[PDB]
Amino acid sequence: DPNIPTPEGYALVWQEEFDGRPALVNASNWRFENWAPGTVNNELQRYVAGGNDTTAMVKDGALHITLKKRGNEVLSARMNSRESWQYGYVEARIRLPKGKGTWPAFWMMPVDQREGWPACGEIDIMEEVGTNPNYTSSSIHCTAYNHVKGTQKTAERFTAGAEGEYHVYALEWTADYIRTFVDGQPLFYFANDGQRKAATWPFDKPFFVILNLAWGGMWGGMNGVDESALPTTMSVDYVRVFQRR
Numbered sequence: 579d580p581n582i583p584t585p586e587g588y589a590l591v592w593q594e595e596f597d598g599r600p601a602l603v604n605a606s607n608w609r610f611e612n613w614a615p616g617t618v619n620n621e622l623q624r625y626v627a628g629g630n631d632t633t634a635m636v637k638d639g640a641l642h643i644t645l646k647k648r649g650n651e652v653l654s655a656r657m658n659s660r661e662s663w664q665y666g667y668v669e670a671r672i673r674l675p676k677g678k679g680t681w682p683a684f685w686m687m688p689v690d691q692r693e694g695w696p697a698c699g700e701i702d703i704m705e706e707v708g709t710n711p712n713y714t715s716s717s718i719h720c721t722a723y724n725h726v727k728g729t730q731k732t733a734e735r736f737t738a739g740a741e742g743e744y745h746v747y748a749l750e751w752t753a754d755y756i757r758t759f760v761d762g763q764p765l766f767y768f769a770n771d772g773q774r775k776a777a778t779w780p781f782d783k784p785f786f787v788i789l790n791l792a793w794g795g796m797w798g799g800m801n802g803v804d805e806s807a808l809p810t811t812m813s814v815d816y817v818r819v820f821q822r823r
């Protein structure tokens with residue numbers, strides 16, 4: 579479609595356009611997590627499937643993931659794409675939520691996780707925390723480069739208005755390098771060192787896309803959380819996946 583900004587040399591292979599009343603997310607594209615609080619990263623939110631206690635819906639052509647307090651729990655949602663891809667251009671148009679304690683994320687995990695994490699590898703396309711507003715980052719995780727060893731590869735940049743406005747976060751992932759962009763402007767770069775060692779390059783297998791909004795946790799809650807900011811919403815206009823022709 580000529581209406582889709584397409585990187586040079588690429589063709590579209592997958593698109594979630596999230597096509598004025600709310601509706602349910604397209605279940606053929608996404609699998610939800612049903613996770614109690616504290617399941618990973620000591621996070622405070624509960625990830626639910628969805629009364630008005632729905633945390634993920636589609637409205638006005640965009641996915642909306644909303645953090646909301648219900649009872650004595652903060653509810654949210656975490657989605658995995660049912661399709662996966664090896665290499666490609668992975669782009670989403672995302673509007674970040676607002677509040678000390680938010681942790682929106684647009685990232686990727688491999689289909690094959692038998693090696694365990696972080697050996698299996700992890701690509702963070704967009705990460706941000708409401709305690710440090712409008713600082714979005716990109717990272718990769720692996721045996722050699724991860725936070726336990728203090729060696730995680732990451733890059734960070736201030737993007738004015740990222741909370742409250744849509745911006746285009748993208749990943750360019752080939753056999754030679756991983757690179758991310760913010761509004762077409764390069765941000766993170768990580769090269770394949772060519773050693774053919776899984777410790778430094780586990781990125782030669784299919785990965786799927788994850789969208790989630792956490793509350794608190796080891797990163798989001800490192801300075802505390804502010805429940806007065808609830809409710810707050812992360813909005814995704816689209817997720818598109820391109821691959822080389």
Ligand SMILES: [Ca+2]
Pocket residue numbers: 595596597638639640814815816
């Ligand atoms: Ca849309």
